[PDB]
Amino acid sequence: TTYADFIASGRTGRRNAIHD
Amino acid sequence: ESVKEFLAKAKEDFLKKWESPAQNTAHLDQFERIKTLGTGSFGRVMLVKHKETGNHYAMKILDKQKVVKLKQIEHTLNEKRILQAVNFPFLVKLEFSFKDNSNLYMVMEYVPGGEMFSHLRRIGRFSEPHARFYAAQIVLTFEYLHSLDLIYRDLKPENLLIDQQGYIQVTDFGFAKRVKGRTWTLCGTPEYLAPEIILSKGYNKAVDWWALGVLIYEMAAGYPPFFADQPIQIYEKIVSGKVRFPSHFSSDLKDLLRNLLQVDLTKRFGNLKNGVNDIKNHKWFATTDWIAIYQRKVEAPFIPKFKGPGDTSNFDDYEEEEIRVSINEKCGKEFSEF
Ligand SMILES: NCCNC(=O)C1=CN(c2ncnc3nc[nH]c23)CCS1
């Protein structure tokens, strides 16, 4: 499931901004 | 056209503060530090108590040398100039600002219910009426901000706080900018970037309406429409623009999202001739009373559980660090206007 894929991903915590 | 009349007077109030910004309105010694509520690349935010009134506030601390190193001087001056000038029920209030030898300080109203991010991840996803309640508040806030020629550029659940009555308070204006033309800075958060930002095109306020589409999707689904383990892979997904919706999304929600998550600027809702009213009058918002939302008369679907006056259970725990103030002034010329 997409939910399962998200929860196993590295981006479920607070996400940092980019300013590149 | 009483929205039109509200906004005309809103602009006159903003411009007076924009042209003559408040400066140096408190001092670090007037506050007792209680607890770190948040900390990352963006800086550090602490719960503090104002000694003379006993009021509680959230104090953002920025290291001047780190701002210079990240080349965020102008963005930081943007943030304080803009935040001290705006006034809207769903924007966090800037109560004081000041600087010392080492740091910049922005003292904001303390919002005890925690970040929407926290509740969204724990609960999993919001029901459509619950997500619609928050979305309506963002729609009105962007209408207010954009009429002042402000672009927000960092919408995400991490920047939305929940107050004691369950309403949203937008925080972190680090990327906000007053601009009438196009602008070009690559900034924001990967999952929320509109395609034109990624493609280095020059862009305008339409990127905020794209970000609203990502937020509504993330609230209603529990995950964002474009995710992957690394940002480069996220950008590839965004620029193709193929969105799949969960089977439980209503037909109206999918239609609103196809018009917000629209790569074609000539078709993206918010950006057309009819402006924000294409969104306000969409079928998904048909049960929404926009005036009652603004007046905060709608009963909120979720009320934070709050025990003490400076109770912090709704925020995570962080390693407390010192607030070191060097003996010598750092970056004096860079931040003279702060
Ligand atoms: N790019 C992420 C930005 N994150 C923050 O700005 C933080 C804000 N926090 C606050 N908490 C309570 N009241 C507040 N008033 C203003 N900010 C407040 C703590 C969590 S992190």
**Is the CB–ligand 1 distance for residue B79 below 6 Å?**
no
Of the candidates B71, B72, B191, the beta carbon closest to that of A15 is on B191
CATH 3.30.200.20 domain position(s) in chain B: 21-114+306-336
Q: Flag if B190 and A15 touch (Cβ within 8 Å).
A: yes
Phi then psi dihedrals of residue B280, to 5 deg? -60, -30
CA distances from B336 to B27, B173, B228, B230 (A): 16, 19, 41, 38
- Tell me the nearest-neighbour CA distance from B234 into chain A, angstroms: 11
Discontinuities in chain B with C to N beyond 2.5 Å fall right after none
Method for structure elucidation:
X-ray
Q: From CA B155, how far away is CA B271, in angstroms rounded?
A: 17
Q: Flag if B40 and A14 touch (Cβ within 8 Å).
A: yes
B162 within 8 A of B302, measured Cβ to Cβ: yes
Of the candidates B72, B189, B223, the beta carbon closest to that of A2 is on B223
Ligand 1 centroid – CA B273 distance (Å): 35
Chain A residues with beta carbon closer than 8 angstroms to that of B153: none
Closest among B256, B261, B151, B279 to B195, alpha carbons compared? B261
Chain B residues with beta carbon closer than 8 angstroms to that of A8: none
Q: From CA B186, how far away is CA B199, in angstroms rounded?
A: 9
User: How crowded is residue B124: how many other Cβ atoms within 10 Å of its Cβ?
Assistant: 11
Q: Flag if B187 and A18 touch (Cβ within 8 Å).
A: yes
What order of strands is seen across the sheet that includes strand B43-50? B31-40, B43-50, B56-63, B103-109, B94-99
CA nearest to A10 within chain B:
B229
User: How crowded is residue B49: how many other Cβ atoms within 10 Å of its Cβ?
Assistant: 17
Q: Whose CA is nearest to atom 7 of ligand 1?
A: B38
CATH number for B21-114+306-336: choose from 3.40.50.1820, 1.10.287.3510, 3.40.50.720, 3.30.200.20: 3.30.200.20
Strands (E), B64-186: 94-99, 103-109, 150-151, 160-162, 168-170, 177-178
The topology under which CATH files domain B3-20+115-305 is Transferase(Phosphotransferase); domain 1 (1.10.510)
Q: From CA B75, how far away is CA B214, in angstroms rounded?
A: 24
CA nearest to A15 within chain B:
B189
Q: Dump the DSSP string for B287-338.
A: T--HHHHHHT-SPPS------SSS--TTS-----------SS--STTTTTT-
Q: Flag if B186 and A18 touch (Cβ within 8 Å).
A: yes
Q: Does B185 touch chain A (CB under 8 A)?
A: yes
B71 DSSP 8-state letter: T
CATH 1.10.510.10 domain position(s) in chain B: 3-20+115-305
Q: From CA A10, how far away is CA B227, in angstroms rounded?
A: 10
- Residue B154 designated active-site: yes
B49 within 8 A of B55, measured Cβ to Cβ: yes
Annotated binding-site residue? B129: no
User: How crowded is residue B52: how many other Cβ atoms within 10 Å of its Cβ?
Assistant: 8
